[PDB]
Amino acid sequence: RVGQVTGLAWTEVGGDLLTIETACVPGKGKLTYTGSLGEVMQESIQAALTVVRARAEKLGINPDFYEKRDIHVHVPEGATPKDGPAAGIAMCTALVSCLTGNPVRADVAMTGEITLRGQVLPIGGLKEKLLAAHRGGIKTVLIPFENKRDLEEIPDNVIADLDIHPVKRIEEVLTLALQNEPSGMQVVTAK
Template sequence: KHLIPHAITKHGLDVKEWAITDEALLTLIRRYTREAGVRNLERELSSLARKAVKQLMLSKEKTVRVTDANLSDFLGVPKFRFGEVEAEDQIGVVTGLAWTEVGGELLTIEAAMMPGKGRMTVTGNLRDVMKESISAAASYVRSRAVDFGIEPPLFDKRDIHVHVPEGATPKDGPSAGVAMVTAIVSVMTGIPTRRDVAMTGEITLRGRVLPIGGLKEKLLAALRGGIKTVLIPEENVKDLTDISDSVKNSLEIIPVSRMDEVISRALTRAPEPIEWEETSVKPEETPAVETPPVEEEVPGLTAH
């Protein structure tokens, strides 16, 4: 009600000469701006108005209408990826939740397994705390292997690669631990994860789920991305009093205190435990995490 009339007046346009549809405005907010205020939104609207003036002067058109279909013609390719739920249940793909300076984000975590010698590689511009979280997740899964239906020798015959997409953005924090465990269990058991479930929580080597920060922003990101169920640490239940009823009523928020609860709800079916006796296979330590070096500090995602 204020920004659009201001842009029209500022650039000498008439209300009949320039218009933007509601769909285009929503896409503009979601994919071209990312901030707590409206400064960048005002800047982008001014850019649209200037280009409308130019188009009106160079053509015989009397009206310029910005739609969702032609928005990129005016502003170029979208600057930001708006979180959306995965299209289908997949093996080794888990939706976590992250906090940023301008709100919450869906955090996709991928795990792949291949023949190898027990190495684990992590990529995605991850900082120290998140890399340590992945190491803890791998150790936990290995310690509970038979409970998840995984034969222990498999760890020494396969390499696992954990990747967090959008590598240009640094990522840090421990709260993706439960998602890391879920991704590793999924890829090692071949059981898909539910695409409509997101989760947040720090993990311990004993399988406890510890509290996190930024719950409000993370729940808003889940709702925005089309998530139906969110698993949160039980110790964060007290923080739900700060969340609006409209958000809580739109999501199934499930408190969890143990990793077993997460696995049972996040996978499409529960893993079946197996019986396993120690053999002559010599146990090895959990492999060290390999990751490319981070060269510079830039603002990023925080799973805290």
């Protein structure tokens, strides 16, 4: 799906999984975000968007086009309170996909705090996040490189059904989550 990403982050009912949605429609450069989102999660969307815009050239988003779009990120179920920083890289991925028409890869989830520099910072509650992904039949989860330590204390039955890809930067997350290569143009070389 274009603009749809599965994040793992905190909701009232524990650190469940989140179905993030995004729309990029004819407009005037307005950003709106909804889904009973707490302050910290809101700010993660703002950080995620700035990350995209700072990388517009590499990702092929023209500023002309971007200022003629409104963006709405919505996170159903609408009434469920969600919060925290851990959907950061999912917001970013969703927004790149939304702006470029680049479909998100099926059966991937991701968790991690985004920074303006593109670094994926570690999150809390990896146990229950991975539990939620397993429960949902997710096949591949992207997690912060720096949470690799936390995999040890997770039951090996859940670990077995999940393909875990620890990531350090947003460029890697995008290559792992989107169908087409989001950064640059493709050069073929032969030896």
